[PDB]
Structure 1
Amino acid sequence: VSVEKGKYSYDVESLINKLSSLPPRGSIARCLDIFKNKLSLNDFALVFKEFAGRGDWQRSLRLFKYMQRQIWCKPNEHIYTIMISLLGREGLLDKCLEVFEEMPSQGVARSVFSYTALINAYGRNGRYETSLELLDRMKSEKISPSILTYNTVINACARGGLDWEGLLGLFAEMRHEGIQPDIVTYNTLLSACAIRGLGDEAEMVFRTMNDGGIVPDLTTYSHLVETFGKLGRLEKVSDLLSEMASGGSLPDITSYNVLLEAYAKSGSIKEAMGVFHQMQAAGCSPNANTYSVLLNLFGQNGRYDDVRQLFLEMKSSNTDPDAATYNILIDVFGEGGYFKEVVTLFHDMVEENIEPDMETYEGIIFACGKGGLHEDARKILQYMTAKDVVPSSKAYTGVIEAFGQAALYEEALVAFNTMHEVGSNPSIETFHSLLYSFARGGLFKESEVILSRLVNSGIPRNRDTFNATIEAYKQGGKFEEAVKTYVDMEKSRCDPDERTLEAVLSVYSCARLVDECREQFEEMKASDILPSIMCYCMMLSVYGKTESWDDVNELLEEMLSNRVSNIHQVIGQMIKGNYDDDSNWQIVEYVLDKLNSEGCGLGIRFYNALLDALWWLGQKERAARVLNEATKRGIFPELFRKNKLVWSVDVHRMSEGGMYTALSVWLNDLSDILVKGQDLPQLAVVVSVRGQLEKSSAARESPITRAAFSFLQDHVSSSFSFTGWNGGRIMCQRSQLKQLNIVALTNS
């Protein structure tokens, strides 16, 4: 270790480096032979200052022994004080008293600062009794203690375990000496009361200094918050603030900031509003910190209406909110499912001329990704790139998952590729998002490519990788490879969650296996897990596959009541047709709106389950209306495309039941045209398979492709043929559209 060049003098720096590089058995005097009559006492004082910070006390002690034997470099008071603190910090209490007792022998009278170093030396080792012996010795030695010397022994007793009555006795001793009291000891008085949970004593300390006309600092109120919070009497802090308000000592905002935050930790909403009204009556102007604390407290308890009103009041309070204040609203609105208001907040934020921060960027990007707002995420990404800001890995993961929600695989892959270009390396969350996005669409070739990427990256495979692979093979129709991967996961490690058993149940139900389905159903419900909508809908679907009307009825009998939850009751009543009325469908729409807050990832699976159940239970009209209300909600954004070029229906992310319902309503809408002279698209297509499988004959035998082809063939005859260039599309030219209510939708 070499001293920084230019920090000290050349001769001083040379001495320190040579002493540092001197062997422990080397000659100290030989080094000092060159520096003899070159360095003053203060120069050696800086040498010991440099040695003390590094922690090499042995060389300092060795040099201090040699300096005693010489007259031209006799140590002074400053040198003695510096080395005493050096020895005490290392725990060498015995060596401290040795040098401290050398002052009478060395002809140096003891000073105040010498005792200050020694008090803290024994203070930091817990020997607070020794400090009081030294403190009393000054009184016998007629040495007037200083404030720092008094402060050192005061805090030494605090760490030593002295009684609280001792600290009060020490403080009263300070005031009687004629030295003006300072709030630092008052902080110590309030700290000890907070440490031992003393409320009445702490309030006495605050009252005592108030009558002295001394303005309290923030630390006094933070201690007051601590002591009353432990005893659960934070209301007395409000009484403390109110008393001084009429006494001429107006409380500051920072005092309220700790008090308001304390109620948030205690969850006291009605106390927080009372304090804010109490603060308003005091005439003080609220700051940014107050704005965020109330929003943080109100947001966590679900008062989304209150925060909107609160934000307008604070915006109209002639105070421009800060970026951190904006961020808190994004988190609650993002968690509350109000994604649109988050984006419109950015519209006003840029119009109010406040530059956002990385935290806000990640918050809005995560909100858009969870809510499937790909366009807003792309806009935010372009905006933050246009301002010379390098995006973080989390933001790129968020935009990737946002693009994957809307089946925009190409944009997600472009963003993933851009991640490496800017140096933002992918994380485990990015791989999880990619795997889920590819599994939703059934692109299992991309799934195995990503698995190979993970295995050559060395990252451990958690349950997310395994169940993403399971559902990717399930949607891709590879049931045998799906169960092979299931047993491979069971072989190694990790405990399957409810999602893994849900995926295996779905793949079993899809591949016409009632026995495994019922076995898994009776096994999983034995764990008292409140079986979800997915299992019930899958069971209804599989029972409708074999026309097990008795099983459907016996499930419905226990499904109708459902005393625990409301969603199951609503769906069970509506599937049977009890909620089809206009007044009886609003409960269903409200429960759907409530459910559309956990994410589009959950919403798509929930809609797949309910559509499969409705289609295979004879409720084709109900399936059509539920799909129609789901489309305008936001789920399945790629379902339909209408333009002069192509009319398309996308089913690669859907189940067999959902595909049939979508095809049923798509064929009907195609029959609506040809009744009017409003032209006709050049092409009508069905996107049965999307991904790498398109340029192969493997997608020809995919369950989605064959199911869609057979449905179209047995509904509209031999009009919808395959594509001679793509292996996963069903096409129909405009000429064959010219010759073309097609599907009968009825309730059983």
Structure 2
Amino acid sequence: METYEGIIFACGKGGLHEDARKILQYMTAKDVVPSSKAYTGVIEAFGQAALYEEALVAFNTMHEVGSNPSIETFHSLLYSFARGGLFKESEVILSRLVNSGIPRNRDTFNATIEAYKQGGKFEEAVKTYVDMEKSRCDPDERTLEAVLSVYSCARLVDECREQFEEMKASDILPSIMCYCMMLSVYGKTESWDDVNELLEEMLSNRVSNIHQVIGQMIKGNYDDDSNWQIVEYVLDKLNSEGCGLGIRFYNALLDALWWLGQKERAARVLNEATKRGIFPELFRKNKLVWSVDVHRMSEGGMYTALSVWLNDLSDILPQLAVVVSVRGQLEKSSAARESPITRAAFSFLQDHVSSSFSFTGWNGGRIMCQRSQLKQLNIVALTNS
């Protein structure tokens, strides 16, 4: 019992869906009724790798064996649905919570916050923020981080720096997040003076080491073979709190690097993240489908992934090269057509490879390119500013 739960929790934290699945089958093969905690662990393990259907199947099987859902199971469900931007599943689970009578803690509120942020619903995000402040409870660092990310995404510099100066007044040792999307938002409007004034304080960082390393390497001082090793050890050290934090860290870093003119550095960061285990759904290569998944990424992370995906396509044939802009219930609707992810990907492909990547006549959240259009096709110039 203890060994099964420990292994399953470790796999879920580390995003090892396959190992958790194998443990589940082995322990079910011995006529052992699974507990709620182990089922929650395997569900959250499946959600790390964006395997929503497997997590939903496990959640459905949870009630079959008599294991009732707990608060941790719901927290994992909201976090997994929020990472992918599936806000419809988010409000469905919220309705399930409201009809189950369980009180909503900060986890539900902030999971909804980033679920609407990744889905592009900025107005609903701020509405849910004001509702969170209306009722009760104190937002943690995660809530203000999510609102800073949503403000940076929706071209709001002024509220961004207001929240920045408000949050740093609490002596909280601001994390990699805040700096990363602050560089991103300042690079949105070519605020080179603000970027430099942030970097001047960022470079020293007498307190922590991670900030110093990343601030040195973003400027290009750590690009050498020996000078990238410090970045590699700091990345390895950071790969211990879990893939849930790793995906956010890589998203923020990629957005900052892409929006600061460091396209080659962003490409190399994405390349080193792929072998780590973060973004396991990023690339699929087979005779049938050559796909890139971006529904869990930010705008900056999408552009870096698309840039390196286009370059690999020109090197080489699959029956179809597709872009998974939106994944979830929104696919069978016109709502995903207007989504910021879909329109951003479409505009990027349109201005880079001309009118070759068309939409899908059956799916509302995919960008399509037949093999015939692949036949007629270094495409994206990756340079450091």
Q: How far 1:468 moved relative to its partner?
A: 0.1
SS of corresponding position for 1:534:
helix
> What is the CA–CA distance in structure 2 between the aligned matches of 1:384 and 1:691, rounded to whole Å?
31
Q: Kindly name which structure, 1 or 2, has the bigger radius of gyration based on alpha carbons.
A: 1
Cα deviation 1:203-243 (Å, max 9, x = unaligned): xxxxxxxxxxxxxxxxxxxxxxxxxxxxxxxxxxxxxxxxx
> What is the CA–CA distance in structure 2 between the aligned matches of 1:607 and 1:401, rounded to whole Å?
20
> What is the CA–CA distance in structure 1 between the aligned matches of 2:72 and 2:115, rounded to whole Å?
17
Cα deviation 1:668-695 (Å, max 9, x = unaligned): 000000xxxxxx0000000000000000
Q: How far 1:585 moved relative to its partner?
A: 0.3
> What is the CA–CA distance in structure 1 between the aligned matches of 2:129 and 2:327, rounded to whole Å?
25
Q: How far 1:427 moved relative to its partner?
A: 0.1
Output aligned runs, 1:504-583, within 5 Å. 504-583=147-226
> What is the CA–CA distance in structure 2 between the aligned matches of 1:713 and 1:539, rounded to whole Å?
28
- Equivalent in the alignment of 1:134: none
Cα deviation 1:290-340 (Å, max 9, x = unaligned): xxxxxxxxxxxxxxxxxxxxxxxxxxxxxxxxxxxxxxxxxxxxxxxxxxx
Tell me the percent identity: 100
Cα deviation 1:499-523 (Å, max 9, x = unaligned): 0000000000000000000000000
Q: How far 1:622 moved relative to its partner?
A: 0.1
Q: How far 1:379 moved relative to its partner?
A: 0.1
> What is the CA–CA distance in structure 2 between the aligned matches of 1:538 and 1:489, rounded to whole Å?
23
SS of corresponding position for 1:614:
helix
> What is the CA–CA distance in structure 2 between the aligned matches of 1:526 and 1:606, rounded to whole Å?
23
Cα deviation 1:164-214 (Å, max 9, x = unaligned): xxxxxxxxxxxxxxxxxxxxxxxxxxxxxxxxxxxxxxxxxxxxxxxxxxx
Q: How far 1:611 moved relative to its partner?
A: 0.1
Matched, 1:479 2:116: no
> What is the CA–CA distance in structure 2 between the aligned matches of 1:504 and 1:573, rounded to whole Å?
27
Cα deviation 1:558-604 (Å, max 9, x = unaligned): 00000000000000000000000000000000000000000000000
- Equivalent in the alignment of 1:631: 274
> What is the CA–CA distance in structure 1 between the aligned matches of 2:117 and 2:37, rounded to whole Å?
29
> What is the CA–CA distance in structure 2 between the aligned matches of 1:423 and 1:494, rounded to whole Å?
33
> What is the CA–CA distance in structure 2 between the aligned matches of 1:718 and 1:407, rounded to whole Å?
30
- Equivalent in the alignment of 1:646: 289
Cα deviation 1:336-385 (Å, max 9, x = unaligned): xxxxxxxxxxxxxxxxxxxxxx0000000000000000000000000000
Q: How far 1:553 moved relative to its partner?
A: 0.1
- Equivalent in the alignment of 1:716: 353
Cα deviation 1:117-175 (Å, max 9, x = unaligned): xxxxxxxxxxxxxxxxxxxxxxxxxxxxxxxxxxxxxxxxxxxxxxxxxxxxxxxxxxx
> What is the CA–CA distance in structure 2 between the aligned matches of 1:538 and 1:599, rounded to whole Å?
21
Q: How far 1:441 moved relative to its partner?
A: 0.1
Q: Give 5+ residue unaligned stretches, structure 1.
A: 1-357, 674-679
Q: How far 1:485 moved relative to its partner?
A: 0.3
- Equivalent in the alignment of 1:432: 75
Cα deviation 1:456-493 (Å, max 9, x = unaligned): 00000000000000000000000000000000000000
Q: How far 1:626 moved relative to its partner?
A: 0.3
> What is the CA–CA distance in structure 1 between the aligned matches of 2:181 and 2:221, rounded to whole Å?
21
SS of corresponding position for 1:649:
strand
SS of corresponding position for 1:700:
helix
- Equivalent in the alignment of 1:706: 343
SS of corresponding position for 1:726:
coil
> What is the CA–CA distance in structure 1 between the aligned matches of 2:21 and 2:56, rounded to whole Å?
13
Matched, 1:418 2:55: no
SS of corresponding position for 1:641:
strand
Q: How far 1:722 moved relative to its partner?
A: 0.2
> What is the CA–CA distance in structure 2 between the aligned matches of 1:733 and 1:480, rounded to whole Å?
37
Q: How far 1:645 moved relative to its partner?
A: 0.2
Matched, 1:734 2:377: no
SS of corresponding position for 2:276:
coil
Q: How far 1:411 moved relative to its partner?
A: 0.1
SS of corresponding position for 1:506:
helix
SS of corresponding position for 1:593:
helix
SS of corresponding position for 1:632:
helix
Q: How far 1:720 moved relative to its partner?
A: 0.1
SS of corresponding position for 1:686:
strand
> What is the CA–CA distance in structure 2 between the aligned matches of 1:569 and 1:746, rounded to whole Å?
23
> What is the CA–CA distance in structure 2 between the aligned matches of 1:706 and 1:563, rounded to whole Å?
42
Q: How far 1:621 moved relative to its partner?
A: 0.1
Question: Which among 92, 97, 102 is matched to residue 454 of structure 1?
Answer: 97
Matched, 1:468 2:105: no
Question: Which among 669, 684, 698 is matched to residue 312 of structure 2?
Answer: 669
Q: Which consecutive segments of 4 or more residues in structure 1 shift more than 4 A?
A: none
> What is the CA–CA distance in structure 1 between the aligned matches of 2:180 and 2:69, rounded to whole Å?
37
> What is the CA–CA distance in structure 2 between the aligned matches of 1:696 and 1:739, rounded to whole Å?
31
Cα deviation 1:364-416 (Å, max 9, x = unaligned): 00000000000000000000000000000000000000000000000000000
Matched pairs, number: 385
Q: How far 1:555 moved relative to its partner?
A: 0.1
Q: Which is bigger in relative contact order (C-alpha 8 A, separation at least 6)?
A: 2
> What is the CA–CA distance in structure 1 between the aligned matches of 2:181 and 2:218, rounded to whole Å?
14
> What is the CA–CA distance in structure 2 between the aligned matches of 1:736 and 1:471, rounded to whole Å?
37
SS of corresponding position for 1:684:
strand
- TM-score (norm: length of structure 1): 0.51
Q: How far 1:433 moved relative to its partner?
A: 0.0
Q: Give 5+ residue unaligned stretches, structure 2.
A: none
